[PDB]
Design a protein around this ligand. Structure first.
Ligand SMILES: CC1=C(/C=C/C(C)=C/C=C/C(C)=C/C(=O)O)C(C)(C)CCC1
Length: 137
């Protein structure tokens, strides 16, 4: 797979609901949903090594990881976690997360390149799943 690109969002589902499961209050959800409606996403992939930068007006994250090697990031709601990404399949990576401190819903994410050339991000918190779809700019 080649996940490299500058990716533009074309669909979001259940993001507000995901934030509600994670305990984000309604005013903060409103801020977040609006900002997340127009993100800039940069991915660079070199084999199993990845750089992903996701930028919005209210939050930007930058992660560097190798598939198969633990790394530290934050959950979508901003809590430090340890993460490990695996290939579920040739074109789909899955990341399990464990909080560094405290308790909360079980969180994960997936990124997949679909047969039509798009990118699907999913983010999960307990049983609630957020689906976001992107195409390169
Ligand atoms: C949740 C949350 C916030 C904003 C989070 C944002 C904006 C996340 C965007 C995610 C994207 C942009 C995902 C993607 O597309 O990969 C703010 C800072 C208001 C503080 C309250 C907790």
């Amino acid at each position: 797979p080649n996940f490299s690109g500058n990716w533009k969002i074309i669909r979001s589902e259940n993001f507000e609901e995901l934030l509600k499961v994670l305990g984000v209050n309604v005013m903060l959800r409103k801020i977040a949903v609006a900002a997340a409606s127009k993100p800039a996403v940069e991915i660079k992939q070199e084999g199993d090594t990845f750089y992903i930068k996701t930028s919005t007006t209210v939050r930007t994250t930058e992660i560097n990881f190798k598939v198969g090697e633990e790394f530290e990031e934050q959950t979508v709601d901003g809590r430090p976690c340890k993460s490990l990404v695996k290939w579920e399949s040739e074109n789909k990576m899955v990341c399990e997360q464990k909080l560094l401190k405290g308790e909360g819903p079980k969180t994960s994410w997936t990124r997949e390149l679909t047969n039509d050339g798009e990118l699907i991000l999913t983010m999960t918190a307990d049983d609630v799943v957020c689906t976001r779809v992107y195409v390169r700019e």
